[PDB]
Amino acid sequence: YDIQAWKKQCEELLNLIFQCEDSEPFRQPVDLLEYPDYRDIIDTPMDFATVRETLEAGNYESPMELCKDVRLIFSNSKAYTPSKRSRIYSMSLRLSAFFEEHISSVLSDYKSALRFHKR
Template sequence: ALLKFVVSITKHRWAHPFKRPVTEKEAPDYREIVTDPMDFSTLRKKVEGGAIRDVASLVSDLNLIFNNAMLYNPKGSDYHTMASTLK
């Protein structure tokens, strides 16, 4: 059920910026601002590998994805809006 949810949220029309880790090329200062990065592909691996076994852990990592995006991207930006909508 957890994996099914992760797969379904990655199909949302605004999920594309969160599907893979942010690269240094895309955002050179990202790791200076976001100390605990998370994305849907990493989350899926954690679910498949058994590191996430309950809804609370899944929600925690989902919130991390969206909170990171809202921390890094200014309010009103597309990424901030996408993250706050998905959250």
């Protein structure tokens, strides 16, 4: 029932994501010089360095906020891809499966701890 445990759990999961080769396109903001029409398609950029920095600054209140920004990484990749077969999009789908498999217990434990707190 530890209401604060989610934060270290999210730090450890971001460390695994940075070790995965599939994360490399998503570690830093998309390069607008490589992709000059990016902002004509994507309204809100997001990357794993920004997520990590927001967490370490104390600017997430809950793991649900962090999950919403990680899901935006994946939805931007799906919106920007020219093909469902593209290399970078294909990397996003494997990394999304790994994230969703690991975040499920973080969310469940946090929401259980808050219910116990308000009992």
